[PDB]
Design a protein around this motif. Structure first.
Motif, PDB file in Angstrom:
ATOM      1  N   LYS A   1       5.909 -11.720  -6.266  1.00  0.00           N
ATOM      2  CA  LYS A   1       4.631 -12.395  -6.042  1.00  0.00           C
ATOM      3  C   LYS A   1       4.613 -13.802  -6.687  1.00  0.00           C
ATOM      4  CE  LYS A   1      -0.253 -11.038  -5.635  1.00  0.00           C
ATOM      5  NZ  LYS A   1      -1.432 -10.338  -6.207  1.00  0.00           N
TER       6      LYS A   1
ATOM      7  N   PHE B   1      -4.792  -1.099  -4.507  1.00  0.00           N
ATOM      8  CA  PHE B   1      -5.892  -2.059  -4.593  1.00  0.00           C
ATOM      9  C   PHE B   1      -6.656  -2.030  -3.274  1.00  0.00           C
ATOM     10  CE2 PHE B   1      -2.780  -3.553  -7.553  1.00  0.00           C
ATOM     11  CZ  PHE B   1      -3.475  -4.140  -8.581  1.00  0.00           C
TER      12      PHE B   1
ATOM     13  N   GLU C   1       6.031  -6.171  -7.620  1.00  0.00           N
ATOM     14  CA  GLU C   1       5.770  -7.040  -6.491  1.00  0.00           C
ATOM     15  C   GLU C   1       6.487  -8.340  -6.735  1.00  0.00           C
ATOM     16  OE1 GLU C   1       1.729  -7.242  -4.895  1.00  0.00           O
ATOM     17  OE2 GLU C   1       2.256  -9.120  -3.882  1.00  0.00           O
TER      18      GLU C   1
ATOM     19  N   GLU D   1     -11.986  -3.879  -5.919  1.00  0.00           N
ATOM     20  CA  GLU D   1     -12.216  -5.290  -6.200  1.00  0.00           C
ATOM     21  C   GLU D   1     -13.385  -5.854  -5.388  1.00  0.00           C
ATOM     22  OE1 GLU D   1      -8.375  -7.049  -5.075  1.00  0.00           O
ATOM     23  OE2 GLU D   1      -7.884  -7.146  -7.217  1.00  0.00           O
TER      24      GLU D   1
ATOM     25  N   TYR E   1     -11.490 -13.792 -11.213  1.00  0.00           N
ATOM     26  CA  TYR E   1     -12.198 -12.958 -10.241  1.00  0.00           C
ATOM     27  C   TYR E   1     -13.687 -13.279 -10.214  1.00  0.00           C
ATOM     28  CZ  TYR E   1      -7.976  -9.995 -10.143  1.00  0.00           C
ATOM     29  OH  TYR E   1      -6.697  -9.517 -10.001  1.00  0.00           O
TER      30      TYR E   1
ATOM     31  N   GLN F   1       0.854  -1.187   0.000  1.00  0.00           N
ATOM     32  CA  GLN F   1       0.000   0.000   0.000  1.00  0.00           C
ATOM     33  C   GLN F   1       0.905   1.257   0.000  1.00  0.00           C
ATOM     34  OE1 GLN F   1      -3.206   0.158  -0.552  1.00  0.00           O
ATOM     35  NE2 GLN F   1      -3.674  -2.061  -0.518  1.00  0.00           N
TER      36      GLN F   1
ATOM     37  N   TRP G   1     -14.645  -8.559  -4.211  1.00  0.00           N
ATOM     38  CA  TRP G   1     -14.660  -9.932  -3.727  1.00  0.00           C
ATOM     39  C   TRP G   1     -15.969 -10.236  -3.013  1.00  0.00           C
ATOM     40  CZ3 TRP G   1     -10.734 -12.837  -5.560  1.00  0.00           C
ATOM     41  CH2 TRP G   1      -9.564 -12.165  -5.933  1.00  0.00           C
TER      42      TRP G   1
HETATM   43  C1  LIG Z   1      -2.630  -8.378  -9.664  1.00  0.00           C
HETATM   44  O1  LIG Z   1      -3.739  -8.877  -8.899  1.00  0.00           O
HETATM   45  C2  LIG Z   1      -3.781  -8.414  -7.547  1.00  0.00           C
HETATM   46  O2  LIG Z   1      -2.576  -8.032  -6.870  1.00  0.00           O
HETATM   47  C3  LIG Z   1      -2.789  -6.975  -5.905  1.00  0.00           C
HETATM   48  C4  LIG Z   1      -1.463  -6.562  -5.263  1.00  0.00           C
HETATM   49  O3  LIG Z   1      -0.870  -7.717  -4.651  1.00  0.00           O
HETATM   50  C5  LIG Z   1      -3.815  -7.429  -4.855  1.00  0.00           C
HETATM   51  O4  LIG Z   1      -3.906  -6.334  -3.926  1.00  0.00           O
HETATM   52  C6  LIG Z   1      -4.485  -6.503  -2.667  1.00  0.00           C
HETATM   53  O5  LIG Z   1      -5.813  -5.980  -2.755  1.00  0.00           O
HETATM   54  C7  LIG Z   1      -6.522  -6.071  -1.531  1.00  0.00           C
HETATM   55  C8  LIG Z   1      -7.973  -5.655  -1.743  1.00  0.00           C
HETATM   56  O6  LIG Z   1      -8.680  -6.608  -2.524  1.00  0.00           O
HETATM   57  C9  LIG Z   1      -5.796  -5.179  -0.535  1.00  0.00           C
HETATM   58  S1  LIG Z   1      -6.651  -5.258   1.019  1.00  0.00           S
HETATM   59  C10 LIG Z   1      -4.352  -5.652  -0.351  1.00  0.00           C
HETATM   60  O7  LIG Z   1      -3.648  -4.809   0.574  1.00  0.00           O
HETATM   61  C11 LIG Z   1      -3.664  -5.671  -1.707  1.00  0.00           C
HETATM   62  O8  LIG Z   1      -2.351  -6.228  -1.611  1.00  0.00           O
HETATM   63  C12 LIG Z   1      -5.159  -7.788  -5.508  1.00  0.00           C
HETATM   64  O9  LIG Z   1      -6.063  -8.342  -4.532  1.00  0.00           O
HETATM   65  C13 LIG Z   1      -4.952  -8.815  -6.629  1.00  0.00           C
HETATM   66  O10 LIG Z   1      -6.172  -9.020  -7.360  1.00  0.00           O
END
Ligand SMILES: CO[C@@H]1O[C@H](CO)[C@@H](O[C@@H]2O[C@H](CO)[C@@H](S)[C@H](O)[C@H]2O)[C@H](O)[C@H]1O
Ligand SMILES: OC[C@H]1O[C@@H](O[C@H]2[C@H](O)[C@@H](O)[C@H](O)O[C@@H]2CO)[C@H](O)[C@@H](O)[C@@H]1O
Length: 275
Positions: free
Chosen positions: A253, A34, A251, A63, A108, A11, A65
């Motif tokens: 990852k 995100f 990242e 997002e 997703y 973040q 979810w």
């Molecule tokens: C590329 O796809 C995505 O990668 C991001 C970054 O790792 C990931 O971000 C997370 O999003 C969360 C909210 O849904 C928040 S709380 C996290 O802090 C953040 O790292 C995405 O979820 C993922 O789809």
């Protein structure tokens, strides 16, 4: 003048932003964050403040979810959407907001290709329009809407434009994509920037909105990442005329997407971004 952005691997605190700027040797024009659909604007605010204090545009990928396109279009999240719109209007500054991204994939739960079969072109478009309508009703005109496609259509029913919610609900279009190299067990292969992005770009170039490369990166293994980076930015500037921003995904990852996954990649990135 191509805008340079990133998700900086965490973040975007003040320190995270400054550290990436030091790393890449240049200011970030855009900072990518995100959040999900159980996150309040108050959690975003400290990050938003850091981004605007730095003189950058905040792009938020939002997002759901927590809600699929049926429940969104039917209004079951409306109190939460309204609250967010209210809070973003009050904040006042220009935010680029990217809800319901990569909906032409199957990973997703809001995506058309998602194996639940709940999401259609129609439910997607209705959900997107509903969000935008609520923001506009609450005066959040500072919020700019970013449509998105994944570089590849993955899963049943997926396409670049079937889910497009229309020019009246969109400020920017965008593409996400990665060069996975030989890192994935599904038999991923090394792909140039052009091999990753050209087909999606061709589709989006038919819409009179500017285009953001909202996520991109390359693996190290399977090829030369330094050369990939050099060629990617050259390609963007030579052949992707409608692209106004390139936002790296930094990242460590699935694999090491970072611009400093090797010294060579970092050196190439620093020179590529220019300015
Ligand atoms: C590329 O796809 C995505 O990668 C991001 C970054 O790792 C990931 O971000 C997370 O999003 C969360 C909210 O849904 C928040 S709380 C996290 O802090 C953040 O790292 C995405 O979820 C993922 O789809
Ligand atoms: O592109 C980001 C997205 O990639 C997903 O993998 C896809 C990939 O996008 C596509 O180019 C390739 O042909 O298929 C794979 C199938 O998974 C990945 O699953 C996502 O988490 C990631 O967000």
């Amino acid at each position: 003048g191509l805008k340079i952005g990133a998700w900086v691997g965490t973040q975007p605190s003040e320190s995270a932003i400054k550290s990436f700027q030091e790393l890449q040797g240049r200011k970030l024009d855009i900072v990518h964050q995100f959040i999900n659909w159980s996150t309040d604007f108050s959690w975003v605010r400290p990050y938003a403040d850091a981004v605007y204090n730095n003189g950058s545009i905040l792009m938020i990928t939002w997002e759901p979810w927590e809600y699929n396109t049926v429940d969104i279009k039917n209004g079951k999240a409306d109190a939460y959407i309204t609250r967010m719109a209210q809070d973003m209007k009050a904040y006042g500054k220009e935010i680029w907001l990217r809800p319901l991204h990569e909906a032409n994939g199957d990973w997703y739960p809001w995506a058309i290709g998602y194996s639940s079969r709940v999401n259609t072109n129609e439910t997607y478009i209705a959900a997107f329009r509903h969000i935008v309508d609520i923001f506009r009703a609450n005066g959040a005109t500072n919020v700019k809407w970013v449509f998105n496609v994944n570089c590849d259509n993955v899963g049943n029913g997926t396409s670049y434009l079937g889910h497009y919610p229309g020019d009246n609900y969109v400020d920017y279009t965008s593409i996400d994509g990665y060069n996975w190299g030989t890192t994935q067990s599904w038999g991923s292969q090394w792909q140039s920037f052009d091999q990753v992005f050209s087909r999606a770009y061709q589709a989006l170039a038919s819409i009179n909105k500017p285009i953001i490369i909202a996520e991109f990166a390359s693996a190290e293994i399977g090829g030369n990442k330094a050369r990939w980076i050099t060629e990617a930015y050259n390609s963007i500037r030579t052949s992707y005329n409608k692209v106004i921003a390139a936002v790296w995904f930094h990242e460590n990852k699935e694999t090491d997407w970072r611009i400093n996954s090797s010294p060579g990649a970092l050196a190439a990135y620093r020179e590529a971004i220019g300015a």
